[PDB]
Copies of this chain bind each other. A is one copy, B any other.
Amino acid sequence: GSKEKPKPTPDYLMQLMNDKKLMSSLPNFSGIFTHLERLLDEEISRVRKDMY
């Protein structure tokens, strides 16, 4: 085991929405982080689906 994975909530998603936008406003982001972008596209996606 390695780290406990905390639950996804609206708070998680509202912050994700601003993170995904912040990175999109950074043309340097694409070069500095590789998987970080896709992880929003999945996390934002799955957080929206697992929404209660």
Contact A12 B33 (CB under 8 A): no
**A33 touches which of B23, B34, B38 (Cβ 8 Å):** B23
Quick one: copies of this chain in the complex? 2
**Known A-B contacts A3-B45, A45-B3; A22 and B32 likewise in contact (beta carbons under 8 Å):** yes
| A-side interface residues, number (CB < 8 Å) | 27
CB distance from A17 to the nearest CB of B (A): 10
Dominant SS among interface residues on chain A? helix
A38 to B40, CA, bound (A): 11
Q: Which residues of A contact B (CB under 8 A)?
A: 2-3, 5-6, 12, 15-16, 18-19, 22-23, 26, 32-36, 38-43, 45-46, 48-49
